[PDB]
């Protein structure tokens, strides 16, 4: 069975709501396991307390920099970065969960949640999950974004874990 994880989202420290994700361990086990472990914090580090630093309405919400908290950082459970596992799954629509990167084989911890189909990212970003519950929370996050992604309020993962 594919694991499911949750984020409790907060806006300037005020709770907004919970988003849950199915992680496609049946197709991308290494990538799903990284996200799962970072969501539980079981390695001593992970997503709890980190923010969504880039939110672009019409496109995606991006987060996961828990090392520097400025969009430049993050790290995986395997080392600073790990390879692109496969590109079997595509960016088919809102709710897709996919890895951010800085080019081939640079997956760390940063990720993005699609709010639209982003097919030109197919074959460049590893898709590894999708929103299960709480898509309305992701939609509610979009109004805190902007054209270039800078956010107007601090959007954080106040808590996270495995269900």
């Amino acid at each position: 069975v594919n694991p499911t994880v949750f984020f409790d989202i907060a806006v300037d420290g005020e709770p907004l709501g919970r988003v849950s994700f199915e992680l496609f361990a049946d197709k991308v086990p290494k990538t799903a396991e990284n996200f799962r472990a970072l969501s539980t914090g079981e390695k001593g580090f992970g997503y709890k307390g980190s923010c969504f630093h880039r939110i672009i309405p019409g496109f995606m919400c991006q987060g996961g920099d828990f090392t520097r908290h400025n969009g430049t950082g993050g790290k995986s459970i395997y080392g600073e970065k790990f390879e692109d596992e496969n590109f079997i799954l595509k960016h088919t629509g809102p709710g897709i969960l996919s890895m951010a990167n800085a080019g081939p084989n640079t997956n760390g911890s940063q990720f993005f949640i699609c709010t639209a189909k982003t097919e030109w990212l197919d074959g460049k970003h590893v898709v590894f999950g999708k929103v299960k519950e709480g898509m309305n929370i992701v939609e509610a996050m979009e109004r805190f974004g902007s054209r270039n992604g800078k956010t107007s309020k601090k959007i954080t993962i106040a808590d996270c874990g495995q269900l």
């Binding site: 880039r54 430049t72 800085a102 992604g149």
Partner: protein
């Protein structure tokens, strides 16, 4: 009142477009790489004894979006064309940016400055003569810069303003 100049910083990803702009505006540098979506800044300066307002567009070098540059190229008045002196591919990318700018603005006379950035680094792969020769073939200035040491930062932007002034007073 003071004149505003619309400067656009272009070049391959990672060459230092943002670091140069941030050195100009904020007087600092960090080794961390925060890739640009699109950023805009304003700064007043004095150039040749004349106060003016720089409107600077810091563009994405991410090549997958190369089809999305026409509008900012039409709007921009002058272009800082940046490569890194340790990255030959970014120097090769310069020709394509210049040809794109000329094609979009439909002119052979577009204010531009060629900027060889990262001159603090020992691993140089693009000779100074190689870049000077290209800039001469383009009819534009060439300036070597380091966003890390601040070498040439003011000079690169101020020179681009001077180029725009010549074009407007032609």
């Amino acid at each position: 009142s003071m004149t505003e100049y619309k400067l656009v910083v272009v070049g391959a990803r990672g060459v230092g477009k943002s670091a140069l702009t941030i050195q100009l505006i904020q007087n600092h540098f960090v080794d961390e790489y925060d890739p640009t979506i699109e950023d805009s800044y304003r700064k007043q300066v004095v150039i040749d004894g004349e106060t003016c307002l720089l409107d600077i567009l810091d563009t994405a070098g991410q090549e997958e979006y190369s089809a999305m540059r026409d509008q900012y190229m039409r709007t921009g008045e002058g272009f800082l064309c940046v490569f890194a002196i340790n990255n030959t591919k970014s120097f090769e990318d310069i020709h394509h940016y210049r040809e794109q700018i000329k094609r979009v603005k439909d002119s052979e006379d577009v204010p531009m400055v060629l900027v060889g950035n990262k001159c603090d680094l020992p691993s140089r792969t693009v000779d100074t003569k190689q870049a000077q020769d290209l800039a001469r073939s383009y009819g534009i200035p060439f300036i070597e810069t380091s966003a890390k040491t601040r070498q040439g930062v003011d000079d690169a932007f101020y020179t681009l303003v001077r180029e725009i002034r010549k074009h407007k007073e032609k």
